[PDB]
Ligand binder design. Structure first.
Ligand SMILES: CC(=O)N[C@H]1[C@H](O[C@@H]2[C@@H](O)[C@H](O)O[C@H](CO)[C@@H]2O)O[C@H](CO)[C@@H](O)[C@@H]1O
Ligand SMILES: [Ca+2]
Length: 128
């Protein structure tokens, strides 16, 4: 049930998991929680999400609490600023160190507690 989009396959889970158990699931399927590196990828993801909430590969790194991608895609603070839901990230409760796709809009991301369970999206490159 992997969906193909521009050189990558994506798995939209049917079962919710915490961020890290989701990541571990992805890794077991030779993938990672998805990165988002273009407007078109963001659009494919939120449209496919169909208004439900999915963990993506957004998580905190370094002592400064910079956002990063678990698949090691360099996180571009400038090119991504427009992908957060207006008002996010807010570190609500100072315990929101992971990111999900939440709104069906280009401004789609919310930061949420890593230990909360949601559906999730794995991403796997097609290697011919
Ligand atoms: C834990 C979490 O997702 N917090 C975000 C928060 O979401 C909450 C729900 O968890 C709660 O059950 O319902 C209220 C509305 O009734 C919120 O949707 O919402 C915050 C703002 O949207 C967000 O910043 C939190 O991270
Ligand atoms: Ca938040």
């Amino acid at each position: 049930g992997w969906k193909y989009f521009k050189g990558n396959f994506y798995y939209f889970s049917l079962i919710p998991k915490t961020w890290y158990s989701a990541e571990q699931f992805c890794v077991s399927r030779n993938s990672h929680l998805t990165s988002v590196t273009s407007e078109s990828e963001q659009e494919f993801l939120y449209k496919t999400a169909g208004g439900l909430i999915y963990w993506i590969g957004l998580t905190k790194a370094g002592m400064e609490g910079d956002w990063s991608w678990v698949d090691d895609t360099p996180f571009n603070k400038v090119q991504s600023a427009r992908f957060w839901i207006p008002g996010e990230p807010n570190d609500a409760g100072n315990n929101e160190h992971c990111g999900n796709i939440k709104a069906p809009s280009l401004q789609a991301w919310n930061d949420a507690p890593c230990d909360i369970t949601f559906l999730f999206i794995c991403k796997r490159p097609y290697v011919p």
